[PDB]
Amino acid sequence: ELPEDPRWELPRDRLVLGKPLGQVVLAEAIGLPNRVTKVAVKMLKSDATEKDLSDLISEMEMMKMIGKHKNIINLLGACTQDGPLYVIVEYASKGNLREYLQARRPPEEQLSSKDLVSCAYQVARGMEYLASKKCIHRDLAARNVLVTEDNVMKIADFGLARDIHHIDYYKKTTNGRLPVKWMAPEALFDRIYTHQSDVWSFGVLLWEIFTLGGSPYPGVPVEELFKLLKEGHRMDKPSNCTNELYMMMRDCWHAVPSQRPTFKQLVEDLDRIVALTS
Numbered sequence: 711e712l713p714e715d716p717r718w719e720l721p722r723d724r725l726v727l728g729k730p731l732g733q734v735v736l737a738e739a740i741g742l743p744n745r746v747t748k749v750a751v752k753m754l755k756s757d758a759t760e761k762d763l764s765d766l767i768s769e770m771e772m773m774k775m776i777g778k779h780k781n782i783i784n785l786l787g788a789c790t791q792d793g794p795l796y797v798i799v800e801y802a803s804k805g806n807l808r809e810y811l812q813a814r815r816p817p818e819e820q821l822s823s824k825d826l827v828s829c830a831y832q833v834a835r836g837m838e839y840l841a842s843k844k845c846i847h848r849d850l851a852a853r854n855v856l857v858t859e860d861n862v863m864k865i866a867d868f869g870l871a872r873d874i875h876h877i878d879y880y881k882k883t884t885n886g887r888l889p890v891k892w893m894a895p896e897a898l899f900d901r902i903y904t905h906q907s908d909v910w911s912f913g914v915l916l917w918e919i920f921t922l923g924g925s926p927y928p929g930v931p932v933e934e935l936f937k938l939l940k941e942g943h944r945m946d947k948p949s950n951c952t953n954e955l956y957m958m959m960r961d962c963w964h965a966v967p968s969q970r971p972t973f974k975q976l977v978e979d980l981d982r983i984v985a986l987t988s
């Protein structure tokens with residue numbers, strides 16, 4: 711039923727399926743001839759519907775068009791014939807950025823100020839490329855940024871299929887958080903997603919980096935959040951964060967979308983700051 715694509719197809723016998731990472735499983739690919747590469751494999755569950763298959767195929771086709779970049783999860787290959795569709799993607803051995811940051815908080819080794827600003831820069835870089843490829847993430851957060859064994863930040867879930875007119879606002883993440891806390895007011899209230907709302911989300915992501923896994927608006931429910939946003943509320947400056955970096959966050963949270971900086975700008979700024987960061 712699935713169309714063959716010689717550009718990305720890998721024989722099934724080349725993919726040794728391993729431990730589930732979260733369905734996404736860790737695996738080893740032989741070749742990609744006599745070397746094995748640890749990869750992540752995305753697949754469907756038994757109780758899945760043809761819709762679920764549709765979405766999975768959509769995410770793969772999306773990854774194909776977007777192309778490669780050091781700071782995004784890249785497509786490595788796929789097993790589409792004679793069996794369950796397997797979408798082989800890059801493996802991130804250190805999990806998501808939130809956890810990575812939390813697991814290094816002082817009472818695993820602590821991160822330096824330069825390390826933190828460097829984390830931000832790489833994320834801005836992944837986004838700059840995605841934006842240039844005409845892609846709107848719609849859910850940029852530290853939970854959706856993965857860290858490789860080499861500490862390379864990689865943006866994930868950028869090719870995901872989603873119905874904005876079907877988003878349950880009263881739904882928590884696996885860790886029990888409310889995704890609406892990363893959405894720009896225009897995206898949340900007017901359902902208007904742009905590279906600019908992604909910038910708003912980047913400001914929230916920056917805040918998580920400088921709070922080392924901090925939760926945005928603890929104890930604040932959907933209804934109260936709407937009110938904060940309507941009143942033009944902005945979170946406080948994280949301790950151990952320069953005024954310069956807080957200003958960046960504040961700039962990303964500009965009420966007017968057109969006045970927010972672009973990822974191209976952010977990349978220039980962060981590139982300059984990193985070098986000035988001890």
Ligand SMILES: O=CN1CCN(c2ccc(CC3C(=O)Nc4ccccc43)cc2)CC1
Pocket residue numbers: 731732734750783799800801802803804805806856866867
């Ligand atoms: O305590 C240590 N660890 C570190 C690794 N981690 C972890 C958990 C999940 C994943 C998933 C994962 C991945 O590695 N690549 C990729 C691409 C798309 C979607 C999901 C993924 C990758 C690593 C779990 C916890």
